[PDB]
Amino acid sequence: YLSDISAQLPSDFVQGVQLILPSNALPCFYVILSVKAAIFIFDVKQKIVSYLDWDK
Amino acid sequence: YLSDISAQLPSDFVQGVQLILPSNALPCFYVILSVKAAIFIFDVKQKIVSYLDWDK
Amino acid sequence: VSGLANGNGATGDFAGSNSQMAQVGDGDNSPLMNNFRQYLPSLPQSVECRPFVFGAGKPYEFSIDCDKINLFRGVFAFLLYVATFMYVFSTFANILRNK
Amino acid sequence: FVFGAGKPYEFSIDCDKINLFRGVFAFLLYVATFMYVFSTFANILRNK
Amino acid sequence: DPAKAAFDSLQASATEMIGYAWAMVVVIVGATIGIKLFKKFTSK
Amino acid sequence: DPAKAAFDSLQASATEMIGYAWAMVVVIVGATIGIKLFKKFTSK
């Protein structure tokens, strides 16, 4: 779905962002995206251990 | 993850915080962090008592 | 059923799900959630602070200086770390509370 | 858009500075959908 | 017309200043939209 | 130039006052950011 609803920041609104941005800004964002993934693997793996109660 | 995204409050914005802060401020924050822990032990221990229904 | 969770493998009738469970992943790396990463919005990077000059050459020339902007970047860093520590923490605590 | 057709006080809100807004507005709508599709796949087993 | 000359000078000057202003507003609006995105990504 | 002397004095005075102001704003902004953090920690 995400292929045709795509747009990029105009080139005039860069000089702004690159005057305010700290160093830990983008690094932080990536963390918020890695914490998500981790929780999805935990969830899938927790539901495969519950299939051990189907043989009783 | 929390080791490289680390930053500390600049030293000029202290004189402010130390003019407004009550006495029960930081003590309260710690409570909000202890209530969290407690609920995590309750949850883990409540799921070990449900394994008593796997032997039937 | 233990080998499709340990990541050791399964041999038998459970030998088809050993390729479906490789797509799920292990740790932080998930082939399924890395498909979403070629389509991430391109955000600009971080450079050192340069001044901005209003009115180059004219009697009315002034410049927004960097000394009072560097102080903002200091407070801004802090308020982004505090807001991530209070997210990582609170997501470990409520791992069994189905959010 | 033209305010005051024909009169001495005729002015027009131009398109050059409106086309720039539509540029930033597109971006801020894609960012807000990518961060919705993503977060709904991740929490598919967390009963929302 | 000693007035026409004067009125023309002041319009010229005004046009120059509006140009410098359209610059400054794009630098500041950039910054504001950039603080608002990062804060959002961070807090539910 | 009895005017040059005067104009110079007033600029000197102005510079001094801007210095005192940059102080006051850091004390008040500190306080405001400190009330906003504590309230957040307390209410979901």
Numbering used by the authors:
A (entry chain AAA), B (entry chain EEE): 57 to 112
C (entry chain FFF): 306 to 404
D (entry chain GGG): 357 to 404
E (entry chain eee), F (entry chain iii): 5 to 48
The authors write:
Most extensively studied in this group are the F-specific filamentous phages (Ffs) that include viruses f1, fd and M13. Ffs are also strikingly simple—their single-stranded DNA genome encodes just 11 proteins, of which 5 form the phage capsid. pVIII is the major capsid protein that forms the filamentous body of the phage. The tips of the filament are formed of the minor capsid proteins which occur in pairs. pIII and pVI form the leading end of the infecting phage, which interacts with the host receptors to initiate entry, whereas pVII and pIX form the trailing end11,12.
The pointy tip is comprised of proteins pIII and pVI, present in 5 copies each. pIII is the largest and most structurally complex capsid protein. In our map, the N1-N2 domains and the glycine linkers are not visible, but density is seen for residues 257–404 of the C domain (accounting for the entire C domain minus the final two residues). The pIII C domain is comprised of several α-helices of differing lengths. Two β-strands form a hairpin loop which extends over the exterior of the main filamentous part of the virion; reminiscent of sepals protecting a flower bud (box 1 within Fig. 3a). We observed two cysteine residues (354 and 371) at the start and finish of the β-hairpin loop, in close enough proximity to form an intrachain disulphide bond. A disulphide bond in this position would pin the β-hairpin loop together and further reinforce the structural motif. pIII is predicted to contain three additional disulphide bonds; two in the N1 domain (between residues 7 and 36, and 46 and 53) and one in the N2 domain (between residues 188 and 201). The C-terminus of pIII is buried in the centre of the tip, where the 5 symmetry copies come together to form a distinct stricture in the virion lumen (box 2 within Fig. 3a). Density was observed for the entire pVI protein, which is composed of 3 α-helices arranged in a U shape. Five copies of each of the proteins are intertwined and arranged symmetrically to form the pointy tip. pIII makes 12 hydrogen bonds and 1 salt bridge with its two neighbouring pVI molecules. The outer surface of pVI (which is pIII-facing) is hydrophobic with two distinct rings of positive charge. pIII forms a negatively charged scaffold around it, with hydrophobic interactions being shielded at the centre of the assembled phage. Fatty acids were modelled into the map according to their size, suggesting one molecule of octanoic acid (C8) at the tip, followed by one molecule of butanoic acid (C4) and then 5 symmetry-related molecules of dodecanoic acid (C12) in the third site. Accessibility of lipids to detergent could explain the change in phage stability; in this case explaining why sarkosyl (with the larger head group compared to SDS) only affects the stability of the mutants with the largest truncations.
